[PDB]
Design a protein around this ligand. Structure first.
Ligand code: P7L
Ligand code: P7L
Lengths: 306, 305
């Protein structure tokens, strides 16, 4: 029993983290096969970030301007290209610890484990959710850039996030491993703001199923609802629309608990309308939205990674 | 900036996890050098668990009754002893992935990472505190037994916890790696209950210092308190007494923020009195007590391994 913010084991990703230096700028890189992936802003000084021309800045750098350290063993850069906002450093050595992996771009609502790194060394691991405003609430200090976010889907590490920036609100913004930013953000120091955020409805329902599995059932009611009627109430309270796809993804949790998705929807509708009445769910006073349906199943069914 | 419940990277511990089978019982073992450590209840059946004599159960076992698997590799048991509530299986091979390690016993309030394992394979990693009542609020299912809790310091793993049981409240009980239970618990299926839990006051204060470091001061006030008046108030909310040792341990955070420990104690007193009035502190609607003072410094100063 019990329910915790639970990260994927970090072993396979720890094996892939390196230091990248270009000038007095040092940050983290991801070493997979004979390529190191890192933020393109490694080629920038703090002043350069005000109005960078990345084409011009890269056209001036050569292979030997980029110093990569893998533990305390130097890799030779034998090529460099830019894909969107990531630098790809082609190196002389394939990473022997390269796991089975893909690059995945995630949807808002999806969670991932962050291996927070400084100077190519891991500091720790935690769970994040891609907010509907395309920011993450992370723990990132200067030098954290190039730290990655990942899921393990069966036997495959899926890399979904690379850390780039901290916004003035203190929330974090980054790219997929193809250098495509999540959200309307740019790698220049200019006025940029997190948009108004919404609650991830499918994840709140996932977490109410977690509560039922852990014996916290007080919020279940005899009422039902239609998808349409649920969404009319949800949208009043700044909750993301629930689609039929969301309903189907919640099918396994519904089957395991014997509580219909629309019955759980009716329970949530009353929670939003009435509040908690100074009660808690899984020892939280607020409705939690940073657990996916799969996160609940993985923790509550003891799914393992080998 | 930002502050998050952060586990240690699990890689060095993943390298030590194996499956241990005795009869129809399978659980997790820790493989360090040529020894595998596991809960001694691996030699029990479900009926055995009410009043087991582990000396009598163990003397009946041969080396070959213990099946230790590390991935696809069968490890050969060449010896066994019992130390308190852990079994030590001597195997023919030293774990090549063995890290630098120590065995430590932690105090209530200290935190560690759990690598939750089933059949010798990892499910996930989370951060935990030894509660004042010597339980942990974990996430563990049947087959989780032998999962370990640890801290990393430089490149040394200190193992402080081995998982043995779940209590009726759903909290979890376990031993150090010398097989001594945290708390008054025993490896028997007899009725045992967690003592009344209390909040870890020094950790809540550490976490308020974290919130200040992260640029949030809304909860501060103009007031101070004596240690004695703080403890008289805090105990009415089932908070642990704050000792002068706790106050000294909060010294570095006090110095970094310029907020005296007893002034932060005054802030906490008001927070218990008023609640958050629809606000949050580091994204939390409750007062968090599973960050130690060292955890705040480590995460706010960017310590690596
Ligand atoms: C060349 O040197 C720099 C590179 C990046 C930064 N910024 C600002 C920007 C990044 C982007 Cl992309 C556009 S502006 C960051 O947000 C980096 C950053 C990250 N995560 C925690 C941070 C914490 C403190 C300070 C910076 C942090 C600043 C300087
Ligand atoms: C020989 O087979 C068994 C061995 C141990 C268990 N128990 C009950 C007891 C353990 C101890 Cl030591 C005394 S009673 C557990 O608590 C294991 C356990 C662990 N963590 C989550 C658990 C969740 C559900 C059920 C059991 C859990 C039961 C059977």
């Amino acid at each position: 029993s019990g329910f915790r913010k639970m990260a994927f084991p970090s072993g396979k990703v720890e094996g892939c983290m390196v230091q990248v230096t270009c000038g007095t700028t040092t940050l983290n890189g991801l070493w997979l096969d004979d390529v190191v992936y890192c933020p393109r802003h490694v080629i920038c000084t703090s002043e350069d970030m005000l109005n960078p021309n990345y084409e011009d800045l890269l056209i001036r750098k050569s292979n030997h301007n980029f110093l990569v350290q893998a533990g305390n063993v130097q890799l030779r850069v034998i090529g460099h290209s830019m894909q969107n906002c990531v630098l790809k450093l082609k190196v002389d050595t394939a990473n022997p610890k390269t796991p089975k992996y893909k690059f995945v771009r995630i949807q808002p609502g999806q969670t991932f484990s962050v291996l927070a790194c400084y100077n190519g060394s891991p500091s720790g691991v935690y769970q994040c959710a891609m907010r509907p405003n395309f920011t993450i609430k992370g723990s990132f200090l200067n030098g954290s850039c190039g730290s990655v976010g990942f899921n393990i889907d069966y036997d495959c590490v899926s890399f979904c996030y690379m850390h780039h920036m901290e916004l003035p609100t203190g929330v974090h913004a980054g790219t997929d491993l193809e250098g495509n930013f999540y959200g309307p953000f740019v790698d220049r120091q200019t006025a940029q703001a997190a948009g108004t955020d919404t609650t991830i409805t499918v994840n709140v329902l996932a977490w109410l199923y977690a509560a039922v599995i852990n014996g916290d059932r007080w919020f279940l009611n005899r009422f039902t609802t239609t998808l349409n009627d649920f969404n009319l109430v949800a949208m009043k309270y700044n909750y993301e629309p629930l689609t039929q796809d969301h309903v189907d993804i919640l099918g396994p949790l519904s089957a395991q608990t014997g509580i219909a998705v629309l019955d759980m929807c009716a329970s949530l509708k009353e929670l939003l309308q009435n509040g908690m009445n100074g009660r808690t769910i899984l020892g939280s006073a607020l409705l939690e939205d940073e657990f996916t349906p799969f996160d609940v199943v993985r923790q509550c069914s003891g799914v393992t990674f080998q």
